[model samples]
Target: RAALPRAQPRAEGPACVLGIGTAVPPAEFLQSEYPEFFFNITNCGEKEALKAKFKRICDKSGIRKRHMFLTEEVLKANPGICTYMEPSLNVRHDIVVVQVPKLAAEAAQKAIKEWGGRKSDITHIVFATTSGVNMPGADHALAKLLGLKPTVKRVMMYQTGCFGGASVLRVAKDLAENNKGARVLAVASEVTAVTYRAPSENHLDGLVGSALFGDGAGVYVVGSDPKPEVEKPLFEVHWAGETILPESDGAIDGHLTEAGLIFHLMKDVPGLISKNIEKFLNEARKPVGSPAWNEMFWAVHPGGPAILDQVEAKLKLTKDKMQGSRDILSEFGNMSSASVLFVLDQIRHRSVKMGASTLGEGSEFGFFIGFGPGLTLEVLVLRAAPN
Candidate 1:
């Protein structure tokens, strides 16, 4: 019983989020100036009509500024990536493979610091990425970069898309709860390098992506049975599940090719989500008593302004219900799977600032909503801890 000092307690609860950390590249670009900057960098200023359309999209993108791994010099140095449909997988993969792990490490270190524990104490790692599709995935590289234990268990998820943060946390919840004394570091890192390319007149979807997507990483520390004296729990993860909209299989799709990644976002995506969200949420909440929608806090992914608007209107939610999602979208754009955690982080800060009773803006129960390909809708039931 000498392990009592750090021994595992009885299996009494589900996984809890012990710490959260987020990071973005140093390169920041303002939306107001991005159309000009994009045209300049991609040598597309000559297309005046298309330039106007891109400008309009940027103005309405609900993003003020976004960060990127590629600086002006990097974009200028690699002309191959600047052209749409250009064969540049080699350039894209090389840059992303290195950056994906580096950014993830930065975020993970912050989570480790916030957790106030030795990095070696972390018994498992769950790394999720929409980038870095090589042999040694970002999960392996992150373990090396963090200098984690040689025997630390690891799981890597590839192309989970916008729901990646929720995906990693869902898996980490099982890992931490299943293994005694386990502390799992869950991370979702994304880089626009995989999909970045010049705007094209024929592909308005690419224009939308250019206007909407950015790069960043988010990390969380999860485990059950807090030490009380040492570790603090933020949100108790009560449940995790997902549902796919039928017949919407190809609504959100991407293909990796010689030209890097080509994503196809259907125009009806917002409509599709709007059509099925209420039903999906109702069915998901069968176990817990049905609380009125506005009674709970929301951590919905800001896929775009349209998606957020459609959801808010469909649910009849108040304006402030989606404040965190809107603010993060305004500040960071969409970092794919990393976006949801940033929304949750924003909520925590807001709760603290408001002196709310719970970390979820005075609500005891909340939902984490993540949207990805396959028309997938991921949901996690969260119980906020008192401040």
Candidate 2:
């Protein structure tokens, strides 16, 4: 009786996303006007055929608008960055040093507010980025800026690219589960400043990558054992798994050169992801029990129009299942690792608006799929919280 009275009840659930927030810089460009702005800033107006081709890329990017930290004024000041290959890595790094952490702070503050937890209660910080490359990186800067405790444990995941969002959450899941009552503030921020370059016909593939990327930050407060009165869990992270397609050594490649971050988007990426996804999901979902494709909600990384199209077609997901991903793609292009969380936020907002029974379009189970370099595929099994 004495032991029973003193002992705490066990928390049986996995880590859940208690709160979410996303932020984009004030500088925004419309896809329709982007080609002109891009070429003009780089003084590449003489390349008519090239401009026309780039215009086509912009048109089909499935993106209406994109927010970025790189404004015309900034571009003009950093003329070297507007060149196809110039020694501009330092210039890019200088800009990201301030913005990435600042943007991350903005998003993290919103998430912590939504979580209804005191800043002192946050036990750890898991920060991911593709933009910052310095020691005492984003994680350190973020904790200092947020005024978090000096003892707040920090882990920085630099250069995690598009899947960093999912990766950070996966790590947060471990932290939250291992440490009782631990609140992990998981955040990811991307700045295109590191990779933005002039439009070049020789680099059409790079042009496609540039056309599809935008800059933003997304944050989540992840924890187990929510205090039902103060904290509201949004989505329970049931499982997280990752797979790298075999023989796909360079399918989605990024090389950091003296000039800047050079990327290669291989033609077979869409095919590889779609062909292997069914089998991957079958194996990953074995523990949770299989729900028909349509029965589950999806939060897929909109790497580009093709990846989404291929996955949706292969999975035979109903059109509605992809609306949130497509909508995020249309609204924000792809904010690298920050994109998936935006999809989650979009789905949740829509569900709340429509008065769905649960946070995931009335479906209890959902999946998050993210693609990154290494031809890496990250998946998460999620169970939506009740309204």
Candidate 3:
């Protein structure tokens, strides 16, 4: 078929990952207790069928626990808080307007703490989110909270969805390369739980939202220094690319109704990804003369088990290669924009635990890939630091 744009010219430069931090809300839900949280799903009799199906699908969802902002206890304490039938604009906005910045700041401060000593070191801030809308967006609040030099630049990336982790890294890469020695703070904070507004409509795809997505935030500090000064070992920026499957353009969407941003997943998505992933990877590698694709370490966003299985089969990756993706999904489900970052953090932590002081030579070179709405796929190719 006449399609595919290979890879955008890979950004060849010294934008290094200074450090990264992740945060989630306090409330956590075991997948088994989903019904307790979704109290709106009535229990008289007929609804038992839906509950049975919900648990069945979730049992096989490959997720053990997921973080969320809202909890069953909150709903029980305030009976009128949720409009089970339909949600209005205020109810939807009310859920996130206060929480987004708080969760976002929690994650941002952790990364900033590792690099904030100089006070003038962090020169810029980049914030990304899909779950909430804000006026003095994350960047504004984060700077004040961190007490940065007032002149530090601020950029906000809004509504980029699941692929946002890789996408924000792309922004970080560009910002770092464009400005010599620039240290950019990139934060992706999402409250997908707030998007859960007791939809008036019902579909297997729509009703199962809580099972698949969780809420969390991820923050990263990027800089152009080849050997950036930071506590954590850095992942040097080598390349960033993106590809789109036009046929699956509308497969996933986040519709912005006055009520709130509602995430919609379609049935055909997994199939489309299976069909297009091979071609997309092959094309991306051609420009860089990339190594055998199977050898690369991957931080593939774990949208679900089906998506990961498809990628494994297509790429012939083994169990270890996928543990990063699997573990995150197991612990946190998919946190939209922050999922891949969490996966990356897990991979980094694993290495640290393995007695490897610095990521040694011959270690896995990372190729992070994430899928978002528009059937868009984003990639960031990086190499681990040498001891």
Candidate 4:
């Protein structure tokens, strides 16, 4: 008798997707309302200047509002807590994790339920965070709370910094390709408010932290292919890539100090990207058959205004090209890993002009890149599923 042939995994099927579900703490605060909470720390001249600059930045970035972990009620309930970090000029640690874990769990639950899949079906869990690291981290806590399988593989990604989400996606994609039957849950949650530092009046980074940065969480369920019955499959992930610049370690650094985590934004970041982006793009595009530059949309991470400006200038992209990214940055104030997903969500809902006729065949090719400590630069090239 002839030997039986082995079954080869079919590559074609329903695409892996970001069944996205986002959550934030019940507490909320508008970006413009900061002064109301920190009035004593800011003088009239500094306040006016900062507010004017903030409005201009936020307007240009197209962000109307942002939600913070600190609520007005909390401020009133504990006046001392309101300014607990005021003396130190940094964010409180307990408050950051307290707000983030709950939000992260909520986001994860939402995504899983949206796909009509039980937590038992999830094969792997990846939790990404840079703000703080708690043992039996959110991944484990979330798994237990949701009753996911005890043996389900768990990976906690820490200090990948802002690029945590994209990096986690890349790893999850690789795992899916290897296992074929596995589904991965990826979560990016940060309360940058924890990194809040009040240095002397002259500290630029501290000032930036106060005026920008907020807290939020986003969860994505990425599987080999969801069953046809799953609802609202936003986009199927195709391919991803990562690149870290050599000797760029000092460019972006995040460290834990008595004052909480300190985030450093180097002045040379723009120059670094400007010099290396073309080469980085060249290498990343090889696997995708090197499509024309203009053929694909760009989902560049908006680290800050300066970073965006440099990227646009270097790539020769017009102002309109980055409208989506800028808008997310302004509105969310860089929720870190959550920020990229926020941009991706916005582009899916508002920016992409997909039509009903091309539901299954339409393809939106794009590159996603983000930078963080270790001067790490992660790149993902993927195509969106048709509407």
lDDT of each: 0.89, 0.88, 0.73, 0.66
Q: Is candidate 2 or candidate 3 better by TM-score?
A: 2
Candidate 4 achieves a global lDDT of 0.66
Question: RMSDs, each prediction?
Answer: 3.4, 3.1, 6.0, 4.5
lDDT of 3 by residue, 1-387 (tens): 678653433333667777778899888888887755564533222466766776787888999998887676655543433554345555645667666667777887777676553547788787777766678776777777777889888788888878888888888888787776577887887786455655333644656565788988888888775443534436877788888886875678778775556666764777888788877777666544676766567788888888898888877876677788899999999888888988887777776767554442235466778888889888878777754
Error at 36, model 1, angstroms = 0.3
Selected candidate, larger lDDT, 1 vs 4: 1
Decide which is better by lDDT, 3 or 4: 3
Each model's TM-score, in the order given? 0.96, 0.96, 0.88, 0.82
* Model 4 bad stretches (over 4 Å): 1-15, 26-28, 33-36, 39-63, 72-91, 229-233, 318-320, 351-363
Candidate rank order under lDDT? 1, 2, 3, 4
What is the overall TM-score of model 2 with all chains considered together?
A: 0.96
**Candidate 2 lDDT by residue in tens digits, 1-387:** 344542433345699999998999998889989988888889997899988988898887899999999998998888888899989999999999999999999998899989989999999999888885987788999998999989888889998989888898899988888777789998989999888988887886788877888998999999998897889999999889999987678877888888888888765888888888899888767777888888888899888888889888898888989989999999899999999989999999989988999889988899987878888999999999876
Backbone clashes in candidate 3 total: 0
